[PDB]
Design a protein around this nucleic acid. Structure first.
Ligand code: MG
Ligand code: MG
Ligand code: MG
Ligand code: MG
Ligand code: MG
Ligand code: MG
Ligand code: MG
Ligand code: MG
Ligand code: MG
Ligand code: MG
Ligand code: MG
Ligand code: MG
Ligand code: MG
Ligand code: MG
Ligand code: MG
Ligand code: MG
Ligand code: MG
Ligand code: MG
Ligand code: MG
Ligand code: MG
Ligand code: MG
Ligand code: MG
Ligand code: MG
Ligand code: MG
Ligand code: MG
Ligand code: MG
Ligand code: MG
Ligand code: MG
Ligand code: MG
Ligand code: MG
Ligand code: MG
Ligand code: MG
Ligand code: MG
Ligand code: MG
Ligand code: MG
Ligand code: MG
Ligand code: MG
Ligand code: MG
Ligand code: MG
Ligand code: MG
Ligand code: MG
Ligand code: MG
Ligand code: MG
Ligand code: MG
Ligand code: MG
Lengths: 206, 262, 145
RNA sequence: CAAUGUAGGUAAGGGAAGUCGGCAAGCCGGAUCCGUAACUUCGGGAUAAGGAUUGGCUCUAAGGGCUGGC
RNA sequence: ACUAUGACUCUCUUAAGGUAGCCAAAUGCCUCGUCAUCUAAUUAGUGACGCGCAUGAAUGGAUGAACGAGAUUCCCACUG
RNA sequence: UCAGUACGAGAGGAACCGCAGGUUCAGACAUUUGGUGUAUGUGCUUGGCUGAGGAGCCAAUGGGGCGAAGCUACCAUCUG
RNA sequence: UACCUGGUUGAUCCUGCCAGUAGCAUAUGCUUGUCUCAAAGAUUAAGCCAUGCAUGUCUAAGUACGCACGGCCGGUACAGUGAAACUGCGAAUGGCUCAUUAAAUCAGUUAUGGUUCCUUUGGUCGCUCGUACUUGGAUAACUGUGGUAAUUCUAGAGCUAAUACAUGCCGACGGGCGCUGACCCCCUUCGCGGGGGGGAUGCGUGCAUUUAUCAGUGGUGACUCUAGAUAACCUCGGGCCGAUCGCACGCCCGGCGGCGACGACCCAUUCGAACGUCUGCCCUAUCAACUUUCGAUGGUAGUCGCCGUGCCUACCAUGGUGACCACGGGUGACGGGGAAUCAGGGUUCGAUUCCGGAGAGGGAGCCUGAGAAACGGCUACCACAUCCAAGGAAGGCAGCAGGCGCGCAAAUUACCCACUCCCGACCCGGGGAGGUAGUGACGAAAAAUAACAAUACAGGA
RNA sequence: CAGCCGCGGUAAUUCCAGCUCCAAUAGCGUAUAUUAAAGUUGCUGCAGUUAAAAAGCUCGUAGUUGGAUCUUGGGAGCGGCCGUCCCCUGCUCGGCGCCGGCCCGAAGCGUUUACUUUGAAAAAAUUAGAGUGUUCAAAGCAGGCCGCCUGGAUACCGCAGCUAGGAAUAAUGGAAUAGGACCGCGGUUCUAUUUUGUUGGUUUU
RNA sequence: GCUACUACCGAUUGGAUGGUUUAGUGAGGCCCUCGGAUCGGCCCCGCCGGGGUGCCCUGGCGGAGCGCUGAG
């Protein structure tokens, strides 16, 4: 099989190694998972010692996290945008670690709205006819007004994130190894790092 | 090799068991246990080779299957269970508790004691692990995991347990002045006061000792076993006191003993 | 192991056909229909016996079970029954009480043990704080000296 | 729109057995990238031999001028 | 001092008597010389042998890379 | 097949009627396989020419694939 | 016991070699009465094998409706044996050999703060807030039809279990702890306010798991250690929180109960295993420069993998070794512990009963398993072999005996688990491991084949 | 025949026989690899004018070896002029404690190798070796008193690695365009933190 | 000159053995995406019991969509 070993290659000096044994079962590698976007399909793997490994192949959602507000949520995986390893992980829609996916802003806009009583997104022009979000933002009691007005002091948000929210889509980085755990969990890109990757995309575009 | 070895040759057994050259090809392989393969003594050996009650395995099997013997306050029917140092092999029919302690030579000695003092034993602790809910756990040399101990029980200490319950009663701290059995290597079965402790990062720390007769000797911690406050023991010690007298002193005493026997 | 067999597709290139008569037709065949053979066994495990005969959870099976006779020369006639499996019997009920009193025991151990550790530890901190108060009185003396 | 010719073509299997004789026809052919022995007047031999690639469509990048580190 | 041969010597004939090298070659009758290789099989071809009917030294001898619309023999691929 | 027989010490070893097939030769035919193929039948395609698309043409049979009919081969088949 | 002698010459003295001398193996020759130990098809051919055996196993306690044996007190299961078959565990050890392989294996030395572990031992095992007085359905063994030329080859019809496979609750569990919070109260103020509390309803509410942010009980030389707080996440090809089993049978105007067996997820443990560090190996120059896009030396990001690393992928950088003998070629080289020899220095050997490695015709590939890239497990191709009704079948002694062949060159198809130990579900089974005899002048130890007296004789104090 | 020198050509101490005699004795002979002998591969330990032998000469990087020079002495007590025992670092927390100071103990730091001494650490088996009447011995690790008594030791174990002592011999640095030491003075910039009875913030000291 | 033995060159693009490799073809596993012989399960109606209060739950006899859906 795909052996992992040093012996198959040269020494530092250049001399060639004569092999002293045939291939062993510990000198073992395995085929890459390459889990793609789609409706759930995870195959399980026996390994050494009778252990388990949930190798993902298709994967629709992930438990993506917003780190600053500390409000992680399970969300459908909409699209792969960019991949630093090989542009072919961008070209062919294939999920791996360090994949820059996109996600639906709405749950984040919804949570902040519940917390601070402020708007998130809402392109300049649209207004809620149901009035449920404004009813939620208004009608505060006296006791609870001290709390929410004080929250307004730290209820500021960045323009760069807010502009995407207006658009609706957050950049997310996968962290969990799907071929390991069977999940495609990750964390949203933020701030200066985000300006960087947009600068790199601006450069890749040229 | 595709895995672990199940047999043992008669010669590879450690010589400090004093196994002979010519009776047979094999030695009895210890099952895994609380004690390492090379520091331990099989029950069959303590019985036939050492105690000499039974000649063959059929007689050991029937005596073992009567179930009188109770190792560390719990019944054990695996004949190659490694009963080790300070380990009280108790027999009920005879009314005879023995404790496995070392002679002046590396070997063990037949040091009988009464059942009253023989009724408890000692255990050196190796490491303090913090448990699943802020619950301190301990780990001894013989694999007993005791939880909720005092934080004051520390790294090189000992504890005076109870065989019936399996719970720490008291403990003796590693400090200057304490007695110390040497439990491995060249000075194996020596006894002496802790005169000085010499630190070494990386390579492990040396302990300088002074014999009752002023004969200094050093030893590394792995082969160390704390045994009492000051130079005064709380336990029964072998005849000899782990002294390891010299060849000249043995020539005089052994020879004189031959002269006394006549 | 790799072995050669023949294909499922039927033709004259065959030696046998094992045939199972499903529906009993017009004529009456003497070899087959006349000699009746019963089914050797019925549910063995009591739980499938319970599903079989719709018996309740509480009542006894021993009463309803059929037992076929045994009889030949020399020996007396006998009847051999099955091992009642899944029987809620006084012994098993004792086992049931047993695990719960043992669970009582592990819960008793965990609780008494945590309270004992809390007392020993809180007492240790009380003496350590008193000795620190002693260190502080020595601390004011040491600074004044 | 027959034979005979003259000049053109193509053929399963076999592959010079035909024949004074591979005569004639046929195989090979241009470029890039590898690789290239015997011998030698040491200049050659040399496109030696021997291999691989080659289309369409859609993109990136590197090389220049002129005026007031741009 | 096996036979053969003749290192060596003499003589007749002419003014000496084929030295170095080479071959059954484009030069050899008898001749398809004999042996080996190349073929299932070879009067051809190639490498040694030499008694050379009648080899041979500027009437030039021997070799020798590159070149030849030069003469023959064999092998690969290829083909009416 | 007759026949492992007659004959002959053995080794060895037939012949006559019947049956199944073959070689060579001659005379026909073309159901099937193959060949041919400018029905210039039909896709593809190189260079150019008709403003572009579409539909087409020239390059001495432009080139390459597959191919009807018809002629036709111990290279298919039949009969003597 | 740190030793030399003959030989070139007409004779002498030298350098100098040849032959002698004594050990240690292998073979063969001749001879041979006793007793105690004892090697034994490596050297050629990692050439080929007919035959037999060499690993199986059951408790009172996983499964009995075959009387196949068995108490007679039954009809309110089962006294008790039990072929068989399912279940479970093991068969990765031992054994045999030394062809390959030259900083590799090995030795010593350390490290895993970079890891896994069937089992053994010890900790945990009504911590979840939401039919359990116990659920579901096959299947074998059995009976009855058969098939083949041929395999311990097997098909169809009737059936049936579980500590196999599936589903799943009330319970303890009665509430807490975070958040939500209609509304309510107190205080203060002209009131908004400002201060203090509560509060319907809802969300969460075990261990284990995964990701992110915040802070610093017990450790360390130093942890991104240990532990804590919050947000939440969790594959149905479902993780745990016992749908088992045996021995006694008690105690409370059917309720509480014992001692075990077995099976459980996680944590420690043991046997150890596995990667790395340091230093050390024989001949050769008639081998002086080597490596590279098929990774050579670094870097960045990933893949795989239990982690660290060109292990693998992609993009950059252009490095690394060399007269201190690299590189390449040889080795009649598995390594070591050791043996022989000796004054002191040294020289050669070491397949071989202990350790480590590799291997079972050649190479390759894989299922199953905690553990195998297994060879007395499978699938190919190659080499070789065995039968056929012509379609097909089956194969591997570098296990033991024994045999072919090679050779100068090497043993009886013996007996036994009684000793030593090992396996298994085990108080009961098995063991060509092992032991025991037979042959055996490789060799070691001790020890007969005559001793004495008296008579003659020859000699001597 | 004879490993070699040599024997055998008619009195053969050398052949074939007999007669004797020698060595070793249940063992000896023959062959081959191999070892001491070999100061004939030599580091200890060879040769090199003439027996075999020095490049025709000089230059030359690695390799190998390299002058001299720096700490000698001192104090108290000791033994038969002589020898030996006792001593020859420095720079936050407590008691030999004594009347803030002094000393000691402890923690941390030390310009650096080779060299030498210790310990630990080393798998057993083997070797040497203590003990031990296998009837001696070769062997084994057992045995011995008439219930008891004992043994079942020990040494060597290269090389490299570690551990603490010693500092003569051999390296190696240091202050020379003084950007040189001590111990001090004052700025510029940055802060460990203590602070003003209680709510908050800063600079100072 | 004669007798015997030993290595050497030597046409035969000589032959025979292994050993690294370049290039064509390339069985067969392992992995993946489809596939779905075949065998279920649920629901749907008609003919009937048992329990409940014209409606809810169960077992049989027929059909068929296979309405949905599973192992494979
Ligand atoms: Mg043709
Ligand atoms: Mg053709
Ligand atoms: Mg002709
Ligand atoms: Mg021709
Ligand atoms: Mg031509
Ligand atoms: Mg040419
Ligand atoms: Mg010729
Ligand atoms: Mg001439
Ligand atoms: Mg001319
Ligand atoms: Mg002329
Ligand atoms: Mg001429
Ligand atoms: Mg020529
Ligand atoms: Mg006949
Ligand atoms: Mg036709
Ligand atoms: Mg045609
Ligand atoms: Mg067009
Ligand atoms: Mg055609
Ligand atoms: Mg002489
Ligand atoms: Mg002379
Ligand atoms: Mg000399
Ligand atoms: Mg000699
Ligand atoms: Mg022999
Ligand atoms: Mg005799
Ligand atoms: Mg052999
Ligand atoms: Mg050998
Ligand atoms: Mg083995
Ligand atoms: Mg070898
Ligand atoms: Mg050794
Ligand atoms: Mg070994
Ligand atoms: Mg090794
Ligand atoms: Mg092997
Ligand atoms: Mg195999
Ligand atoms: Mg066998
Ligand atoms: Mg095996
Ligand atoms: Mg063999
Ligand atoms: Mg036995
Ligand atoms: Mg055997
Ligand atoms: Mg004589
Ligand atoms: Mg000598
Ligand atoms: Mg020598
Ligand atoms: Mg001379
Ligand atoms: Mg000379
Ligand atoms: Mg000179
Ligand atoms: Mg000279
Ligand atoms: Mg000097």
């Amino acid at each position: 099989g795909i052996s992992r070993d040093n012996w198959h290659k040269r020494r530092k000096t250049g001399g060639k190694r004569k092999p002293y044994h045939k291939k062993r079962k510990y000198e073992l590698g395995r085929p890459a998972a390459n889990t793609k976007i789609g409706p759930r399909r995870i195959h399980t793997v026996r390994v050494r010692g009778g252990n388990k490994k949930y190798r993902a192949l298709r994967l629709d959602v992930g438990n993506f996290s917003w780190g600053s507000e500390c409000c992680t949520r399970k969300t459908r995986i909409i699209d792969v945008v960019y991949n630093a390893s090989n542009n072919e992980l961008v070209r062919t829609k294939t999920l791996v670690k360090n994949c820059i996916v996109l996600i639906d802003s709405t749950p984040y806009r919804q949570w902040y709205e519940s917390h601070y009583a402020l708007p998130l997104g809402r392109k300049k022009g649209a207004k809620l006819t149901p009035e449920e979000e404004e009813i939620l933002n208004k009608k505060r009691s006296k006791k609870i007004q001290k709390k929410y007005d004080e929250r307004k002091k730290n209820a500021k948000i960045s323009s760069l994130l807010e502009e995407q929210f207006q658009q609706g889509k957050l950049l997310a980085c996968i962290a969990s190894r799907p071929g390991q755990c069977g999940r495609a969990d990750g964390y949203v890109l933020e701030g200066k790092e985000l300006e960087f990757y947009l600068r790199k995309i601006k450069a890749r575009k040229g | 090799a595709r895995g672990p070895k199940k047999h043992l040759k008669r010669v590879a057994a450690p010589k400090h068991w004093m196994l002979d050259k010519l009776t047979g090809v094999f030695a009895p392989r210890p099952s895994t246990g609380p004690h390492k393969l090379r520091e331990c003594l099989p029950l069959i050996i303590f019985l036939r080779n050492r105690l000499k009650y039974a000649l063959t395995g059929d007689e050991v099997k029937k005596i073992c299957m009567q179930r009188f013997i109770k190792i560390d306050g719990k019944v054990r029917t695996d004949i190659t269970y490694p009963a080790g140092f300070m380990d009280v092999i108790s027999i009920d029919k005879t009314g005879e508790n023995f404790r496995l302690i070392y002679d002046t030579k590396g070997r063990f000695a037949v040091h009988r004691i009464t059942p009253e003092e023989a009724k408890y034993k000692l255990c050196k602790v190796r490491k303090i692990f913090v448990g699943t809910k802020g619950i301190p756990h301990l780990v001894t040399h013989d694999a007993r995991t005791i939880r909720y101990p005092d934080p004051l029980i520390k790294v090189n200490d000992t504890i005076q347990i109870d065989l019936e319950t399996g719970k720490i009663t008291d403990f003796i701290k590693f400090d200057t002045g304490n007695l110390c059995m040497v439990t491995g290597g060249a000075n194996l079965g020596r006894i002496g006061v802790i005169t000085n402790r010499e630190r070494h990062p990386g390579s492990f720390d040396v302990v300088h000792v002074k014999d009752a007769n002023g004969n200094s000797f050093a030893t590394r911690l792995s082969n160390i076993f704390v045994i009492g406050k000051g130079n005064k023991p709380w336990i029964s010690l072998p005849r000899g006191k782990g002294i390891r007298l010299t060849i000249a002193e043995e020539r005089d005493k052994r020879l004189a003993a031959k002269q006394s026997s006549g | 192991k790799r072995k050669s067999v023949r294909g499922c597709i039927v033709d004259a290139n065959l030696s046998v056909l094992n045939l199972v008569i499903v529906k009993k037709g017009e004529k009456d065949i003497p070899g087959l229909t006349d000699t009746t053979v019963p089914r050797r066994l019925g549910p063995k495990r009591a739980s499938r016996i319970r599903k079989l005969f719709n018996l309740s959870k509480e009542d006894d099976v021993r009463q309803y079970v059929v037992r076929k006779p045994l009889n030949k020369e020399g020996k007396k006639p006998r009847t051999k029954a099955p091992k009642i499996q899944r029987l809620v019997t006084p012994r098993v009920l004792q086992h049931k009480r047993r695990r719960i009193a043992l669970k009582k025991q592990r819960t008793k151990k965990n609780k008494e043990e945590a309270a004992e550790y809390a007392k020993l530890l809180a007492k240790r901190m009380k003496e350590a704080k008193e000795k620190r108060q002693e260190q502080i009185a020595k601390r004011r003396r040491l600074s004044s000296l």
